[PDB]
């Protein structure tokens, strides 16, 4: 599973910079080692800050404050493809920020045949207003009357004696 | 001498030979109580719950 | 050896508690704690001789 880490890093102090600036990003990685590497790669290509001259000052995994409340998350991502420059925004309805990011990775890796390294997340926000929801699918999920039958039921001991009911 | 190698993590007699301290070890000591001072300031919480 | 082994174990526990307490006070007060970089590393060879 994925874990959301907040990573704060800064360059090593020198005579030119007694005290450096602190740079913090909230990024998703299965383990802390991946998060630290991704943070340095983001800093290298955004601030041109080298890992050799920089150090990680803090790192903390963040749990979802309300994992029992359904929420709608809008994710702004950057796609690196054969062209190598795409900006996309998707909306996922789930209970935790981790699940939405995992759903996004599964969706893009399936539809667009992408990879973890290519995909970079600019921002993840929680859509707290129904009017702010843009996708029609999510708007349906927020309708007052969710009403649908059980989908994809499909339900060793081979050679069953009777035909399956596979219904109500 | 040493026809067979015996694991100190399994053979307790070999462990007492190599480590003359495992007799008095007391691994699980209790240092906490019902007065744990949760230490997380509002400044750190605001930074953590930011963006 | 018994006294030396007891001293070593108490040193490990004191050092481990020291890191926990120092990080707790840095987290609570507001600054950040940077623990010492590792000095001992364990290397395992995962590729063959071909």
């Amino acid at each position: 599973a994925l874990k959301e880490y907040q990573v704060v890093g800064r360059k090593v102090p020198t005579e030119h910079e007694p005290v450096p600036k602190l740079f913090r990003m909230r990024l998703f990685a299965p383990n802390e080692s991946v998060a630290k590497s991704r943070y340095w790669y983001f800093l290298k290509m955004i601030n041109k800050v080298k890992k050799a001259t920089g150090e990680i000052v803090a790192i903390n995994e963040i749990s979802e404050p309300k994992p029992l409340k359904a929420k709608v998350f809008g994710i702004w991502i950057r796609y690196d493809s054969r062209s190598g420059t795409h900006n996309m925004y998707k909306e996922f309805r789930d209970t935790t920020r981790v699940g939405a990011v995992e759903a996004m990775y599964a969706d893009m890796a399936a539809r667009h045949r992408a990879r973890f390294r290519s995909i970079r997340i600019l921002k993840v926000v929680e859509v707290e207003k129904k009017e702010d929801v843009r996708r029609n699918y999510v708007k349906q999920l927020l309708n007052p009357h969710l009403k649908f039958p059980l989908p994809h039921r499909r339900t060793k001991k081979v050679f069953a004696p009777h035909r399956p009911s596979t219904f109500y | 001498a040493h026809v067979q190698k015996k694991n100190p993590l399994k053979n307790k007699a070999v462990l007492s030979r190599l480590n003359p301290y495992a007799k008095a070890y007391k691994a699980n000591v209790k240092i906490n109580s019902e007065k744990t001072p949760k230490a997380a300031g509002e400044k750190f919480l605001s930074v953590l719950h930011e963006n | 050896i018994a006294k030396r082994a007891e001293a070593y174990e108490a040193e490990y526990r004191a050092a481990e508690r020291e890191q926990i307490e120092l990080a707790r006070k840095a987290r609570a007060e507001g600054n950040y704690f940077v623990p010492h970089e590792p000095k001992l590393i364990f290397v395992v060879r995962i590729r063959g001789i071909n």
């Binding site: 005290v19 702004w76 | - | 840095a26 940077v34 010492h36």
Partner: peptide, 19 residues
């Protein structure tokens, strides 16, 4: 060695990758 980094006047700034 272990050291502290004061956050006074050096508050961390959240970063986002360039679109």
């Amino acid at each position: 060695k272990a050291h502290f980094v004061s956050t006074e006047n050096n508050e961390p700034v959240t970063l986002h990758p360039v679109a």
